[PDB]
Structures are given as structure tokens and as C-alpha cells.
Symmetry: C3
Subunit: 259 residues, 3 copies
Amino acid sequence: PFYDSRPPEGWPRGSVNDMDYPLLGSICAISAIAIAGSGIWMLYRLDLGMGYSCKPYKSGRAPEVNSISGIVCLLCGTMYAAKSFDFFDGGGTPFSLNWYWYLDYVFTCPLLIVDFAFTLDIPQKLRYSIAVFVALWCAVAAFATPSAFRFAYYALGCCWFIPLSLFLIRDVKKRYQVYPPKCQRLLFWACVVFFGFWPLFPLLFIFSWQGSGHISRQAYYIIHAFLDLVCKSIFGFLMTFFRLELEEHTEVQGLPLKE
Amino acid sequence: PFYDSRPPEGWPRGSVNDMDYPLLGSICAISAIAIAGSGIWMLYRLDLGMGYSCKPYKSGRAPEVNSISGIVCLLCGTMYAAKSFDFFDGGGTPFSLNWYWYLDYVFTCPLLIVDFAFTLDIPQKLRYSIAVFVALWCAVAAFATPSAFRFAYYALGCCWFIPLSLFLIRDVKKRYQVYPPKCQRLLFWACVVFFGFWPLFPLLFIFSWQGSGHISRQAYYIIHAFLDLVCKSIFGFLMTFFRLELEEHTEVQGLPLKE
Amino acid sequence: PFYDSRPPEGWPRGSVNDMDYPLLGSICAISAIAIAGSGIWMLYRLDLGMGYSCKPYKSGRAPEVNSISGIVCLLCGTMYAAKSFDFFDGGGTPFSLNWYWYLDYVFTCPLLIVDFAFTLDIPQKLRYSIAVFVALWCAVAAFATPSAFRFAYYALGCCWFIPLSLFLIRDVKKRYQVYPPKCQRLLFWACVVFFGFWPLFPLLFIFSWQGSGHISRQAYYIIHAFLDLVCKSIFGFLMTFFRLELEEHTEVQGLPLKE
Ligand SMILES: *C/C=C(C)/C=C/C=C(C)/C=C/C1=C(C)CCCC1(C)C
Ligand SMILES: *C/C=C(C)/C=C/C=C(C)/C=C/C1=C(C)CCCC1(C)C
Ligand SMILES: *C/C=C(C)/C=C/C=C(C)/C=C/C1=C(C)CCCC1(C)C
Ligand SMILES: CCCCCCCCCCCCCCCC(=O)O
Ligand SMILES: CCCCCCCCCCCCCCCC(=O)O
Ligand SMILES: CCCCCCCCCCCCCCCC(=O)O
């Protein structure tokens, strides 16, 4: 933290920072390995060529944007390693990626939507990416604010998040009929992640310590490990296989989209 | 702030933070709505097509860079909402966009000059955008520094700001003769904003509490609301209409620039 | 700093912040001028045309990416000016670019590798630039962390830094045979800077106050001034002359690469 520190005696018992630090560090360490591990495979696989047939790129190089899926996993995995270091040191360490909720998401979530946009040829990538960015800053503010104005930041966040989700549904509906069936099946599941799991984050806030107070900070850390596995890693596998299926169809078999 | 906080008793009377917080929150709330409102219209209008005749894009998509004007207004408006939240909570709230002068401009001002550069086909966009960025960081430092070194940061800021303003005048003089008369008229007014209102910010510093001490913090907050309306929103309307007039000429009427 | 401040009495004698502040400010001021000075020349020279013969660009504009070398020097020089201001004010000033080791490198080092990548036509520029970025954040954490976990952040940093150095060697080996001999000679020396001086930073950590404790903070500030002169300014001159020699060969003499 910028200001706070763990007392040398340790956090007081029952305080909000009296959590199970070895348990949380363990979960973060395992999450670090799985997510980074998945990112490595994604980048490895991209360099093998186009589609399942692994047809050589004409450039001899894979396209830069295709790396985004794998990179985001490498980034998120690295951040989970840092988070484990903080937890195994007992929390509140100077360089804590655990302390400011959602602060770490300000970098990765705009990359996710950009990746989705390039993969699907959704228009107005600049508009979507900045929208996610601003939304995440609203979440940071909502967790950082102790007063009733935390609800004001929530609503400000929803003014970006809900419009952008509805626009994206609209866009995705337009693209979906373009693609062959095996791509349609992977795009369905990518949609379940985006339109199904992204709304859970604002839903959880309502039961958090900033809302009804039904979910503790410890539980929240565990729940986000799992949500990060789905929204970064599984999501990444879906984008990767979506592209392999597309390339198999268009590049390796030379068939046209139903555009 | 990172360190400071409002006492629970409130700020001491006559302290520098003893301002009229309901007045400032009111002005920020209204500024939030006007500026974001203008951004929404800008994006709406862009999607209607090219020029006044609203001729369909060949891509079926407007160009990404054209969104910059509208996005900057959405961003600035959102930041004014946050600023109102801070003021209505009584100032010094943890997540304050009011506390560090010019910190919020570090994102938006480079976007403004990029927008201007793309709209006018000014060369070396990377050089201009980083120049503005660095200049704004010098302003942040100048307001953050209590000693006589605040003048050192001012001068460092002027080493970027004055060179870049003189280069931009030179560039603008080169483009101005290229364009048809209705574009020339809107470009004149865009220049009045850039070369006329941007210098006011460093001019105001000299009379601020970091200079002669003639202008208070409360007054400064009000003055910047107005300057933000001109430099983001009006500026945004000028870029938008400039493009509509250009496209009417080149795209809808198929006439050539005097290049 | 976010939290700490110099006592008004001054730092206590023998404390870690009891350094020779006029000496450090002097060295930073001189470094500011040389590095920024070199950046100015680089940008000036770029605008003169292609190669030694200064053949006009067909666009009438030099390519944006070519500005990166010069810009990085302007940026690094500006940061050295700020660093001098902090040192001449006696250290620990609110806006200190001296306080958080490596924090200032988080912006400039990714620009260096991008510049190198574009200059040499190395593939996967996104992968290299983010790799450097993440590595530098690991260094920031390693210096910021007082516990034995500083070694954990070091190792995390090495998981990015060593892979990316080995990949880059591999890539550079592929390009080297493409280019004419005078380019080969400048590329050799660019490699001595990258593969020879970049490893020194992690090597120095081991003898720093975060390792064996053989090198003081004062010495570290001086050593980095020199390393910054080599890794930004000299490196910048090498990229510039490499391009002039390439353009003389391909553009002004119209000979083909051995691709
Ligand atoms: C990889 C992690 C992801 C996709 C995280 C996403 C987070 C959100 C969609 C957060 C949204 C919001 C809150 C948690 C509270 C404030 C209001 C929202 C909607 C911006
Ligand atoms: C939308 C807001 C804008 C365009 C703000 C611009 C701000 C500046 C041009 C500031 C300049 C400087 C100071 C206020 C003081 C330090 C020196 C300058 C020239 C960098
Ligand atoms: C212009 C300055 C440059 C090129 C600085 C580079 C810095 C590094 C290569 C730093 C590396 C690391 C440490 C200093 C400690 C943590 C581990 C590393 C390898 C990330
Ligand atoms: C007072 C502040 C109001 C906040 C303004 C909210 C604006 C956010 C909505 C825009 C998101 C849309 C993203 C893509 C749209 C598209 O591509 O069609
Ligand atoms: C000691 C530090 C000195 C600071 C160096 C100041 C350099 C800034 C001037 C460059 C801005 C020019 C922007 C565009 C120029 C162009 O496109 O021709
Ligand atoms: C638990 C965290 C593990 C950290 C993961 C380390 C991954 C970094 C290695 C990738 C760097 C490679 C850069 C370019 C590679 C290429 O272009 O071929």
C-alpha cells in the first residue's frame, strides 16, 4: 500500500486483514502456474502455423494481434505470482497487487476485449477498449471509497459497462452468421464467458463488504482466482481454437466466409 | 490523496482546503453532463456517414481515429463526475481527481493533439503526442513541488511546450492552404482554441498559489471547468464539423484538395 | 515519495539518505544535457533525408518509428533534469524520480527494444516490448521489497528477462546475414550494448544494498548515469547510423539486402 503497513506484531485478530495467508498464497501460486502455463502453450502453438494443418505463414511470421491471448495469460500469471509473494509475506507488503481491488485489471481487461474484437472483426476497437478501461477505473474507485459515494462510482461504472455489453451483443449477433459451424460453436462459448461471467463481477460487489456484507475478503480472493482462470485462461483457449478453426476453413481449405 | 485525508472534524477554517464544496460539486456535475453529452453526440454523428449528405462508408465502418474527439469528451465528462463525487463528499476523499493538479490531463491532452494531427494530416504524430504528455507531467510536478524548484519544473515544462507550439504553428501554416474555405474557417477557430487557450494554463500558474498568489484554489477549479469546456468540448465540435465539411467536399462532391 | 519525506532538520547522519546531494545533482544535470542534446541531434538528422546523401523522402516525411531513438533520449534527458532538481533540493522531494528504483525505466526500456526491433525487422514486436515492461516492473518490486521476497521478485524478473534475451539473440542471428558489412559493424556494437550492458543491471543488484551490500546508493546513482548514457544515448547513435547506412545502400544506391 501507499500508506498502510502490516504492524510488526501482525494484523490485530478479527481485523479485516486477519485472513488465512498461507491458504491464499497457495491458491495464488497454483493459479500463477496454470494461467502462465496456458499462455506459454498459446504462444508456442501460434508459431506452429495456420490451422490444424499448420500451414506456413506467407510472412514466415504470425500476426502480432494473435499474440494478445497468450500475452494476457502470461501477464495475469505473473501478477498471480506477485500476489502469492505478498500473501506468503503476510499481506500489506509495500508492493502489493492484493491491496487495491481491481487495480491489476486496469491493464488486462482492455486487452481481452481487443483480442475478442480482432478475432471476430468487430468494428470500433478503440471505442470498446477505452470503455472497458474506464469501467475498470470505476471499479477501483468503488472499492477504494468508504462512503455512500461508493454507490455513485458503481453507477458511473455501470454507465460504461452496460452500454458496452449491449453494443457488443449487437455486434456479435452481426458476425455470428458469417462463420462456419465449428467456429459458431466456439464463439457461443466465448459469449458465455463474456456475457455470462463478466456481469458476475458487478454482481458480487452487491454482496461484498462494500454492499450487503455477505462475502468476506478472503472468499473474494478465492472467487477471483477462479474467475481469472475462466476469463483469462479458458477465454484464451477459446480464442486460440476459434482462430485455428477459422484458418483451417479459409486458409487451409480456401473456403469463403458467409459474409 | 496518497497520504493526506480530511480530518473527521472537517478541514480547519481558513486552511487551504476550506472551500465551498457544494458549489464546486454542482459545477463539476453540470460540466460532467455537458462534456459527456457532447461526446455522445459526436460518436452518434460519426456513425451516420460521411459529410452532411451522410454517404455510407465503403467499409460500412467509420475510421477508428475519428472516434478520438468523442472519446476524449466521454473521458473528460466521466472524470468530472468523479470530481463532483469527491467535492460533494467534502474533498480529500481517497480516490480524488481533484487533489493532484493536472494529473488527470496526462491522459486526455495527448489525445487532443493526436486528434488534431490526424484531422489535419500534420506529420510526426508520435513526436507531438509525447511532447504534450511530457509537458503535462512537468505541470503535475510544478503543482506538487512546494520549494523554489517549482519554477525549475515550470521552465522544464516550457522547454517542451513552447517548442511544440511553434512547430505546430509552422505545420498548420503548411496545411491551411490545402483546404477549401469552409474548412479554412473551422480550422481558424480550432487554432484560436489551441494557440489561444492552451497558453492560458501556464499563464494562470504565475498568478496561482504557486506564483503571485492572486488566484485561489476554489477559483482555479471553476476556471478549469470552463477551460475544459472549451478545450475538450468546443474543440471536439470544431474537429467534427471540420471533417464533415472536408468529406462533403472530397467524398460527397469528389473535389480535390489544393495540396 | 508517497509516504516518506525529508525531515526539516535534514536526514540523520549515516542514515541511508545521507548522500552527497550537490555531487549527485551535478552529475544528473550534465547527464540531462548530454542525453537530451543527443536526442535533439537525432531528430534533427532524421528530418534531413535518407542516408548520408540526404535523399528526400517520397512522403516528404520521415517514418514515425524512426523518431523513437531520438524521443527516448529526449525523455531520458528530461527525467535526468527532474532527478537533478530532486537532488539539489536535498532528496526525498514529493515528486522524486530518484526514490523508487527503476520506476522511471518502465516507460523507456520497452521503447528501446521496440526501436531495435523496427530497425532490424525483428518479428513479434508486441511480445518483446511487453516482456521488457514486465521485467522492469519486477525490478521495481525487487527494490521496493525489504524482505527475503525481494529474491522472489528477482527470480520472477529473470523468468522474463533471460527468455527474452535468448530469443532476441536468436532473432538477431537470423537478421545479421541479411545486411551489408557497414551495417553488420554497427549491429555488432548495438549487440554489445544490449547483450553486454543490459545484463549488468541484474548483476549489480547482487552487490547492491538488496544483496551483498558492497555498493552504496550514492554509487548506484552514479553508475546508472553512466549506464543510461550508454544504453540510451550511444545506443541511439548506433540505431541512427545503422539506418543511415542501410538507406545509403538500399535507397540511395538501390542495392538489395541478402535476405
Ligand atoms: C479478468 C477480469 C475481468 C474481466 C474483470 C471485470 C470486471 C468488471 C466487469 C467490473 C465491473 C464493475 C464492478 C466490479 C463494480 C463497479 C461497476 C462495474 C460494472 C464497472
Ligand atoms: C484539456 C486541458 C489542457 C489542454 C491543458 C493544458 C495544460 C498546459 C498547456 C499546461 C502547461 C504548463 C503548466 C500549467 C505549468 C508548467 C509548464 C507548462 C507549460 C507545461
Ligand atoms: C535504460 C535502462 C535499462 C536498459 C535498464 C534495464 C534494466 C534491467 C535489465 C533490469 C533487470 C532486472 C533487475 C535490475 C532486477 C530484477 C530482475 C531483472 C532481470 C528484471
Ligand atoms: C456523466 C458521465 C457519463 C458516462 C458516459 C458513458 C459512455 C459509455 C458508453 C460507450 C460504450 C460503447 C462502446 C462501443 C460502442 C460501439 O462501438 O458502437
Ligand atoms: C534538459 C531537457 C531538455 C528538454 C528537451 C525539449 C525537447 C522538446 C521539443 C520537441 C517538441 C517538438 C514536437 C514536434 C516537432 C516536429 O514534429 O517537427
Ligand atoms: C509464473 C510466471 C511465469 C512467467 C512467464 C515468463 C514468460 C516470459 C518469456 C517470454 C519472452 C519472449 C519474448 C519474445 C519471444 C519471441 O518473440 O519469440
